[PDB]
Chain A
Amino acid sequence: GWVRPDLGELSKVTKVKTDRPLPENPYHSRARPEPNPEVEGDLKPARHGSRLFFWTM
């Protein structure tokens, strides 16, 4: 027997079952950066202006 597969032998990415559970957190898989809080909330005009050596509004 053994019909020859020819040009259709491969590619066609194969689907396969395995009993072993997939590895989680593969390789090192360290802790997260603890990201920085994003800016939120309605903001109104600034207070009294440039605040500089002078120049109010």
Chain B
Amino acid sequence: RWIARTFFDAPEKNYERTMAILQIESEKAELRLKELEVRRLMRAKGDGPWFQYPTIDKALIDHSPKATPDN
């Protein structure tokens, strides 16, 4: 009684604690495989935010009316 109650923790506390750690690192591992999937896909699709290599900016094209002959 003395030993157990003062120095230790119930199989309750430890047990459910392990339940929580398995929650945490579980969902981590899952989401790691997710990000490997994502970044794997991004170089092919180039859709989303991660991989962007800036082209030349359209901001300056000089739309102004120019020397008439053409273009």
Contacts and interface: CB of A to CB of B under 8 A. Distances in A.
Interface footprint category on B: under 10
Interface in B13-54: 24, 27-28, 31-32, 35, 47-49
Contacts of B49: 39
User: Taking chain A's interface residues, is the majority helix, strand, or loop, or is none over half, making it mixed?
Assistant: loop
Q: How large is the interface on A (under 10, 10 to 19, 20 to 34, 35 or more residues)?
A: under 10
Contact of B48 (A36, A47, A51, A56): A36
A48 interface: yes
A36 B24 contact: no
B47 A51 contact: no
A48 B32 CA distance: 12
B47 A47 contact: no
A48 to B, nearest CB: 6
A51 B25 CA distance: 9
